[PDB]
Design an enzyme around this catalytic site. Structure first.
Site, PDB file in Angstrom:
ATOM      1  N   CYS A  92      39.995 -48.180 -34.214  1.00 14.57           N
ATOM      2  CA  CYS A  92      40.374 -49.069 -33.087  1.00 14.57           C
ATOM      3  C   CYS A  92      41.902 -49.111 -32.954  1.00 14.57           C
ATOM      4  O   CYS A  92      42.399 -48.974 -31.817  1.00 14.57           O
ATOM      5  CB  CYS A  92      39.845 -50.478 -33.303  1.00 14.57           C
ATOM      6  SG  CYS A  92      40.508 -51.246 -34.803  1.00 14.57           S
ATOM      7  N   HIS A 252      40.685 -56.307 -35.614  1.00 21.44           N
ATOM      8  CA  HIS A 252      40.230 -55.286 -34.638  1.00 21.44           C
ATOM      9  C   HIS A 252      41.197 -55.212 -33.453  1.00 21.44           C
ATOM     10  O   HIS A 252      41.451 -56.271 -32.827  1.00 21.44           O
ATOM     11  CB  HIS A 252      38.824 -55.605 -34.150  1.00 21.44           C
ATOM     12  CG  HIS A 252      38.278 -54.568 -33.234  1.00 21.44           C
ATOM     13  ND1 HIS A 252      37.815 -54.867 -31.971  1.00 21.44           N
ATOM     14  CD2 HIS A 252      38.122 -53.240 -33.395  1.00 21.44           C
ATOM     15  CE1 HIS A 252      37.382 -53.768 -31.399  1.00 21.44           C
ATOM     16  NE2 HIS A 252      37.562 -52.755 -32.250  1.00 21.44           N
ATOM     17  N   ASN A 272      36.952 -53.150 -24.838  1.00 17.46           N
ATOM     18  CA  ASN A 272      36.491 -52.990 -26.242  1.00 17.46           C
ATOM     19  C   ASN A 272      36.064 -51.542 -26.487  1.00 17.46           C
ATOM     20  O   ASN A 272      35.302 -50.972 -25.671  1.00 17.46           O
ATOM     21  CB  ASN A 272      35.394 -53.969 -26.662  1.00 17.46           C
ATOM     22  CG  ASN A 272      35.462 -54.273 -28.146  1.00 17.46           C
ATOM     23  OD1 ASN A 272      36.218 -53.642 -28.878  1.00 17.46           O
ATOM     24  ND2 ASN A 272      34.687 -55.242 -28.604  1.00 17.46           N
TER      25      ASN A 272
END
Ligand SMILES: *[C@@H]1O[C@H](CO)[C@@H](O[C@@H]2O[C@H](CO)[C@@H](O[C@@H]3O[C@H](CO)[C@@H](O)[C@H](O)[C@@H]3O)[C@H](O)[C@H]2NC(C)=O)[C@H](O)[C@H]1NC(C)=O
Ligand SMILES: *[C@@H]1O[C@H](CO)[C@@H](O[C@@H]2O[C@H](CO)[C@@H](O)[C@H](O)[C@H]2NC(C)=O)[C@H](O)[C@H]1NC(C)=O
Length: 308
Positions: A92, A252, A272
């Site tokens: 990520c 994240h 996302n």
């Protein structure tokens, strides 16, 4: 840690009850069957080395709306609405960044379509952290400051679309089937019939707190922010998320692409890195002004240098 699924229909329903229907968690969603250890995997922030962002008098002394989507401020930047699929990496941190450097090459870098390789970034910056055990957004951009990355046309992301559903709409494999280590840092393009092209920033910097996020997003386009994922966040399906229940799963990194107000609730539109299956068509909203799970704490952006 455990092979314990993270989502229990008690848990989700308690979460749903707590959150005051501001945001629908979902039990039988696309993450239902997810393992504690899998979900921790997904959250690859570990560990400013960037200078803090200076607003010009006129930047700082200007009127930001009370809605904004980067997709719409920049209809002609196809990079913006595209949603990435980090896969079964703690990638990520890299994927978040490349996604925004792609977008900024359009918003400022005078290059419409160029997907910066999260491949290249995720393997070759040992400064940043340890590939798919996670890294530091700050560094990501400092490397695009110092070294530079290649496009995804050159070193295309090496991990396919995997799904966290039994049956998949978009007919993907399962992510419970794979688990990927940092890939080989390569110095030429995957295909040798394609030449290498360096893409870099001539300056990376760092952002802090509700305001700066809105100015920076507005002028210069999407950029990279992190937050603390809590079990509840995995079940998210709709509305403006805020942490109500569940253990902390790690840091994240996600691409901030907007803000807005929903029935009097301040939010950040965010992209996302888990598929277009998860959340709202791949995106989620998160509460804004609270610095919810510390979203408004650390922000990482840069100005793509236009090649030749
Ligand atoms: C740098 O270059 C190599 C490509 O030469 C990339 O590593 C390679 O990644 C490919 C997929 O991108 C791997 O393919 C896989 O092979 C295994 C079979 O053992 C299979 O289980 C998978 O389904 C897939 O087909 C390949 O094995 C692997 N080879 C090496 C030498 O690492 C690497 O990802 C590239 N790095 C970047 C930044 O793009
Ligand atoms: C979560 O887990 C189970 C896997 O054991 C899934 O249940 C089966 O899924 C198939 C189709 O994908 C159905 O035909 C069956 O009705 C299900 N039950 C069985 C085999 O007894 C379940 O669908 C999974 N759900 C998600 C969203 O991943």
């Amino acid at each position: 840690a455990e092979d314990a699924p993270v989502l229990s229909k008690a848990f989700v329903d308690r979460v749903n009850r707590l959150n005051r229907g501001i945001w629908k968690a979902k039990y039988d969603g696309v993450m239902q069957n997810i393992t504690l250890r899998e979900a921790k995997r997904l959250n690859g922030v570990i560990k400013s080395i960037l200078p803090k962002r200076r607003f010009t008098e006129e930047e700082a002394c200007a009127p930001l709306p009370s809605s904004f989507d980067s997709a719409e401020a920049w209809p002609n930047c196809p990079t913006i609405p595209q949603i990435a699929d980090q896969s079964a990496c703690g990638s990520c941190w890299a994927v978040a960044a490349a996604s925004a450097m792609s977008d900024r090459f359009c918003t400022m870098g005078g290059v419409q379509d160029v997907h910066i390789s999260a491949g290249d970034l995720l393997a070759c910056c040992s400064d940043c952290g340890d590939g798919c055990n996670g890294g530091d957004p700050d560094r990501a951009w400092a490397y695009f400051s110092s070294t530079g990355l290649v496009s995804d046309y050159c070193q295309p992301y090496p991990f396919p679309h995997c799904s966290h559903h039994s049956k998949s709409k978009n007919g993907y494999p399962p992510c419970s089937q794979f688990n990927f280590d940092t890939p080989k840092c390569n110095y030429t393009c995957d295909d040798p019939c394609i030449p290498v092209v360096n893409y870099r920033s001539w300056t990376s910097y760092a952002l802090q707190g509700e305001d700066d996020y809105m100015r920076e997003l507005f002028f210069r386009g999407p950029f990279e922010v992190a937050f603390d994922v809590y079990e509840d966040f995995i079940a998210y399906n709709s509305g403006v998320y805020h942490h109500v229940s569940g253990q902390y799963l790690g840091g994240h990194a996600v691409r901030l692409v907007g803000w807005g107000t929903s029935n009097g609730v301040p939010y950040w539109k965010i992209a996302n890195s888990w598929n277009t299956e998860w959340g709202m068509d791949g995106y989620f909203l998160i509460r804004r002004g609270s610095s919810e799970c510390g979203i408004e704490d650390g922000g990482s952006a840069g100005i793509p240098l236009a090649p030749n």
